[PDB]
Amino acid sequence: MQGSVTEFLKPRLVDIEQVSSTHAKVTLEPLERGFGHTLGNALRRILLSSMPGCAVTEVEIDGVLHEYSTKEGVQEDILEILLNLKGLAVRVQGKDEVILTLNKSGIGPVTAADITHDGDVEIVKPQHVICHLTDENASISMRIKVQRGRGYVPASTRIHSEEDERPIGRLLVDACYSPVERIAYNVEAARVEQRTDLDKLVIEMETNGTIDPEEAIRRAATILAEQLEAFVDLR
Amino acid sequence: MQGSVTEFLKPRLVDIEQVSSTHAKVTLEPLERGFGHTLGNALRRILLSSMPGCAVTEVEIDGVLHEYSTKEGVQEDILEILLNLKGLAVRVQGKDEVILTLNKSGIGPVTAADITHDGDVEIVKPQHVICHLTDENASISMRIKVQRGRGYVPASTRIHSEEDERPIGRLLVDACYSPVERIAYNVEAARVEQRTDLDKLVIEMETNGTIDPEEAIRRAATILAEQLEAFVDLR
Amino acid sequence: SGLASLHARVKVRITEYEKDANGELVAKTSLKDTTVGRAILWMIVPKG
């Protein structure tokens, strides 16, 4: 309600100009004495392990059977190609698993923009150079598989058998499902109608691209609303 | 809904055994990695200034005109009696102001149990010794006045004129409207069907007696629900 | 390779990451302790 003059006639002017899915300048005003560091540290506490995401789990390559072979028509090795596929960020709206179609022959540096566009898959970095291709029918094809997880679980306890039934040629890859990369906060002051000693907590947020920052901070906001009903009941 | 297995099939077994109006052992289970200290500190952040209460504002005494006189038939002075009236906790259900009737003559230590019971006033501490009375018609009478406030506002800016129209004998008293006194939290672990690394955040809550802990944590809960609709709208 | 050896622990000579950003992510999950304040001191003051 309106109540007395502490914070009740003090609106929080928190507004939006969006950069697509990877970084956002988050602004905040006004909050009173000593309210910057607990904000940055509590949503550094939540936004590192409590956030699910969709990362790279297990990649199938062509006739190259394991990670340390060679392919006729490529300069780099398959280990550096898969290393370039580890850093590839992908967004999946509402699918549990999806297989990404990729094929390109001839000369030309294949980037992430050559991936066949799906209705629920959007590439955040089309400029990511993976490997350099040459002549003499250098046909490369991959099947990128995306699964849901949260945070880091190692590749020795999860161990998965997609193609470990009789046709083989897959092996499990380390997965970093954690979306939130960096949050940096500035602690300048603000002023509104009620009181003067009020802190403006401007945030530089950085996300890899697996989960959008709006949906992630809304999920972390309702998780926070689920948190502080702890002091409620008796016994 | 049921969704995937993160927290959705994980009920919060938060139950009630009530101690009347002053302290409550609050139990909680289960919450995952790193969810004890942000709970205790966020509802230490809310439950110190955001909570209204009803405390002692201004007390009228009998023919003793100011705080530093003497009364025929009492051992202690009026300043220690009013000091004992500062620590008296009182609950008011739905009244803006109420006047408490108190009268006792003869020998006998007058405590808070001698106050005339009102339909909306309940005494939490009847064992509070105020002063020691003697013989020789030691008749004492007071008019305890209760008003609504929130938190600490000093007695030099509020200044009130109840009996400062022509009959005098009142002066303004410092008021601590803040109900919540102490919350201490223990951070042992819990286990439920889904996952194992889950924290049991057991709370020792302490309240003076002005506002009940159930109503205070429900008000602070819906104030918290009013808080985190901040990240919603654009501009 | 020092995290399993006696040369490096969770407060002695260890850093295994590319940049500053997720080094505090790894440090918060009890895997690293040092060269995070040296990593965040190198970007808090020269950002403004």
Swiss-Prot record, chains A, B:
One Gene Ontology biological process: response to heat
MF-aspect GO terms: DNA binding; DNA-directed RNA polymerase activity; protein dimerization activity
EC class: transferase
Gene Ontology CC annotations of this record: cytoplasm; cytosol; cytosolic DNA-directed RNA polymerase complex; membrane; transcription elongation factor complex
Identification of the protein by name: DNA-directed RNA polymerase subunit alpha
Post-translational modification: (Microbial infection) ADP-ribosylated on both alpha subunits by the phage T4 protein ModA. ADP-ribosylated on only one of the alpha subunits by the phage T4 protein Alt.
Top-rank taxon, per record: Bacteria
Keywords: Acetylation, ADP-ribosylation, DNA-directed RNA polymerase, Nucleotidyltransferase, Transcription, Transferase
Record-stated family: Belongs to the RNA polymerase alpha chain family.
Nucleotidyltransferase recorded as keyword: yes
Region (Alpha N-terminal domain (alpha-NTD)), start-end ranges: 1-235
Required for interaction with Crp at class II promoters: region residues: 162-165
Domain text: The N-terminal domain is essential for RNAP assembly and basal transcription, whereas the C-terminal domain is involved in interaction with transcriptional regulators (such as CRP) and with upstream promoter elements.
Curated annotation (Swiss-Prot), chain C:
Residue ranges that the Swiss-Prot or TrEMBL entry lists as coiled coil: none
Biotechnological applications listed in the UniProt record: Co-administration of salinamide and rifampicin or salinamide and myxopyronin suppresses the emergence of resistance to both antibiotics.
Post-translational modification as stated in the protein's UniProt record: Acetylated on several lysine residues in the presence of glucose.
Family classification: Belongs to the RNA polymerase beta' chain family.
Subunit structure: The RNAP catalytic core consists of 2 alpha, 1 beta, 1 beta' and 1 omega subunit. When a sigma factor is associated with the core the holoenzyme is formed, which can initiate transcription. The rRNA transcription and antitermination complex (rrnTAC) consists of RNAP, NusA, NusB, NusE (rpsJ), NusG, SubB, ribosomal protein S4, DNA and precursor rRNA; S4 is more flexible than other subunits.
Function: DNA-dependent RNA polymerase (RNAP) catalyzes the transcription of DNA into RNA using the four ribonucleoside triphosphates as substrates.
Name this polypeptide is given: DNA-directed RNA polymerase subunit beta'
Organism of provenance: Escherichia coli (strain K12)
Gene that this sequence comes from: rpoC
Residues of the full protein shown: 539 to 586 of 1407
